[PDB]
Amino acid sequence: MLGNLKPQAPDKILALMGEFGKIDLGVGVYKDATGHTPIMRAVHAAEQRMLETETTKTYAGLSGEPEFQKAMGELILGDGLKSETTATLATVGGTGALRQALELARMANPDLRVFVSDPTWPNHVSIMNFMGLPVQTYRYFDAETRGVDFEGMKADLAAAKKGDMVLLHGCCHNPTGANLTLDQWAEIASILEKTGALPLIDLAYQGFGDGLEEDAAGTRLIASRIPEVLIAASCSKNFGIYRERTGCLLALCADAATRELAQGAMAFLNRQTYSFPPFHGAKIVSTVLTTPELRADWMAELEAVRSGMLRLREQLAGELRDLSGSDRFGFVAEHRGMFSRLGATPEQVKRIKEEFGIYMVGDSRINIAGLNDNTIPILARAIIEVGV
Amino acid sequence: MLGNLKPQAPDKILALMGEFRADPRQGKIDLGVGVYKDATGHTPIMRAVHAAEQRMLETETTKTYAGLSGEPEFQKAMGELILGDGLKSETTATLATVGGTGALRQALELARMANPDLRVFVSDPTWPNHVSIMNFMGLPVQTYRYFDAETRGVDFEGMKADLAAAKKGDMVLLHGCCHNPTGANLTLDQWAEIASILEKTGALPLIDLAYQGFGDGLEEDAAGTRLIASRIPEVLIAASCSKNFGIYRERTGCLLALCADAATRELAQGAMAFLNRQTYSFPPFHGAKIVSTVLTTPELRADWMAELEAVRSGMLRLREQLAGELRDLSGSDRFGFVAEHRGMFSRLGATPEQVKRIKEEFGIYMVGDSRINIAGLNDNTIPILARAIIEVGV
Ligand SMILES: *Cc1c(COP(=O)(O)O)cnc(C)c1O
């Protein structure tokens, strides 16, 4: 039977990792001055504390632990968290949350379609194709200005109908690095409540843009306006626990009844897929979030990380400017997050990796965290050489 | 939109515990638990597991994304733990999963990909979650006879007669050992006949191995699996580390796809990695790394096998004790099956109505299909359970 298995297409980023004076600017992970993805101080201390506190490993919560559910909701929605109308499900990372999100929605609407940003995280489309869900795209990135084509984005969203879902990146847009301003979010919230489109928000980098609270701004704004929203959150990057596989899905409902339904359907969704969700990472998160000392240090370390990358973008932007006189690559300093699409054509990007030894995703997505004072001028010179 | 969503029934475990906690009787007993509990009513963390967690705590330097289909240390160690020397790396595809359940679901996804018109035969009875996952996937589900309510043993003739109807490409689900919920298992000889039926029918076997080490031993419990693995070219195995390693909440397991040749292994392995990727991307590291540590570190592997064996001997003596008590109470050897059952579970063969009477009259709680958890017994509880059984006329 297994011989009928058709060969499946590889994931670009994972494959890029395969093809890797080498410069790793591919996969979206934070790296320090010495090319390492360290473990956060609070995370380590949490784990040490867990080693002493835990006395059992019996089956726990089917939808995650109360502490994880509550601490995550507060971190995301702040004071906009209305427990009585909010359903929470602990999942296997953000990706698990996204998949569970699409499953929940499709159960509620067998005829749903999903709009995604042009461009968006490749894995978004793969999951949707696999489930067989109709994918539509809304303009978002502006090829020329490297910013957001907001006039076009609004145009496309207006075509969304009731029952459709619109996937929005809460902050730090992957792969572009181009992000909406709170003013732009308020307008989208207007369109959404006119169309009736259910918004699904991919919150994977809360803390890498402008700050823990600031990066959650747009999400809090949508949640305040739209009576029903879905948020797929990830603790992989902002907590640096990538391999622990921890995130969660929040279902904001209009009332307690609808909320009770969702919560039930969410628990069931976990039961029929893998039973209980992974505990270790979730426990690290809540332990950090509910322990003032730990939370304080974590916030501090995350701030240091978000600050450093900001400094790097400026160095890089400057390096390029002085390397060409033109302030064309200014968009790099304007972008926010870990990625930024250089705009290099497919034929140019290949030159870079084969000759310059610098590996960046084929669509010119560079993980700014992969740069440093030593490699920045090299990258700058490298792309100047590649010209047009 | 979410208001449409149809009401999804609870996990039922909570309902079982619900009425139990509400019971105002100081001497109430709970044999409905689905986890191991030592003499003091606790589900302890195995010494080796705690040893592994400290070592990981001192040696892990990063938490970056690792293996999509799991880490090599885990895949190899697990395949060895299961298939022993019979492990053929060349034709074996492995996938780290989110517990045994994740393994079962991934196995069904993989199978359905290769054969859309797949049907699945499950035992009668079998782990409820089997049925629910299948129903949710929309797969056709057939049943083959298994438990014999009269002898509490395996109705093998019935099993064979029904399994004979399986067609080429159909999937037959087998519990490799310690059949949950029955406790009634196949002797190595019966396993050999099952293999014959499978070769004949061309059905693909899916073996659910969640209790390796809880029956007659690590190797002994893997016998049925190894027999099938050597005679059948394609076998799917969904292992669990939840119970035998005591890391339930860690969610550790794996799917092994035994193929007829390398080219096919490359096909299956690719499809498995794809299934992880499309469901939740990377699998959970912590538990799988605890496992590959105990298994590769001689000192720890030693202490783990010792602890598991102690637990095995312990539950086994409990069975002998319960059956001994039952013998003296009934004046017959009717309940001898309890000493012959293997695993932590056992279906007494009591009707739902007899089950209710026991609860009300004796304060003893158990699953509604009369499944009890051997680990819940002890020198004080056994005399009461024994008397209850006789008293309610089981
Ligand atoms: C990281 C990320 C996710 C989720 O990753 P997980 O490893 O599954 O936590 C989802 N979407 C985007 C855009 C991401 O960058």
Ligand SMILES: *Cc1c(COP(=O)(O)O)cnc(C)c1O
């Ligand atoms: C426990 C169990 C499983 C798997 O459990 P996980 O906790 O998901 O690892 C599978 N089958 C049976 C029969 C079980 O008892």
Ligand SMILES: O=C(O)CCCCc1ccccc1
């Ligand atoms: O680098 C990124 O795009 C962020 C996420 C990286 C991890 C990831 C890569 C491929 C598929 C799933 C998850």
Ligand SMILES: O=C(O)CCCCc1ccccc1
């Ligand atoms: O059936 C049993 O009692 C053993 C497993 C019980 C807990 C469990 C419930 C759902 C999915 C996986 C595991």
